[PDB]
Design a protein around this ligand. Structure first.
Ligand SMILES: [Cu+2]
Length: 227
């Protein structure tokens, strides 16, 4: 149970919920065919569009509740340690990131982390105090994008619709950059199936721990767009 609530650009905190499309609470989306899978069930947004240089180190911050409603003492902040799973970021080119609707966009993946050497992306998130990072591709065309950030908690993912999707979107404007417009994109909903090997999955191993039995974890969705 967590909410995407801030972006940082090369270390500069952009502000609490600034440029963020956010849900009313920290409950997961569990229906991958719902429009909620795009940017969550959005109940607040603003007209701010964050400036993001191509090539910049982008941080996305997750907290158990909105801002002050989650404290440094909370064992489930940024998220409960049990909630093992991957963290991903997608972009979609839009006309105006502040005014665009979210249906029918063409999404491409720019970052993902799953399971490696016994450690999940969520473990990194906890180690880094609620922040997850990626480098904005250098070659991407400048301008308005929606940035979809996603954390999938898999501690109850062995059952249908048991995977817990924590999602939000940020409104961004990429500066500098190149001319790349990814030819292969995906739809939300559409990109995920409830039967995907990284969504319908029992992550508990031989000794009952969340180690996925040491097996490779297949992060849902497409290959990364790269420069
Ligand atoms: Cu939870």
């Amino acid at each position: 149970h967590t909410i995407f609530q801030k972006v940082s650009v090369n270390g500069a905190d952009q502000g609490q919920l600034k440029g963020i499309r956010a849900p009313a609470n920290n409950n997961p989306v569990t229906d991958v065919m719902s429009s909620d899978i795009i940017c969550n069930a959005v109940t607040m947004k603003d007209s701010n569009v964050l400036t993001v240089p191509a090539g910049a180190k982008v941080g996305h911050f997750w907290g158990h509740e909105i801002g002050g409603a989650a404290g440094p003492n909370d064992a489930d902040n940024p998220i409960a340690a049990s909630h093992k799973g991957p963290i991903m970021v997608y972009l979609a080119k839009v006309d105006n990131a502040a005014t665009t609707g979210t249906s029918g966009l063409k999404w491409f993946k720019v970052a993902e982390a799953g399971l490696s050497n016994g450690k999940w992306a969520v473990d990194d998130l906890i180690a880094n105090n609620g922040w997850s990072y990626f480098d904005m591709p250098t070659c991407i065309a400048p301008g308005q994008y929606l940035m979809r950030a996603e954390l999938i908690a898999l501690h109850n993912a062995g059952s249908q619709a048991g995977a817990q999707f924590y999602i939000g979107c940020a409104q961004i404007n990429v500066t500098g950059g190149g001319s790349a417009s990814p030819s292969n994109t995906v739809s939300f909903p559409g990109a995920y199936s409830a039967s995907d090997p990284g969504i319908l999955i029992n992550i508990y191993g031989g000794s009952g721990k969340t180690d996925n039995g040491g097996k490779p974890y297949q992060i849902p969705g497409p290959a990364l767009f790269t420069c």
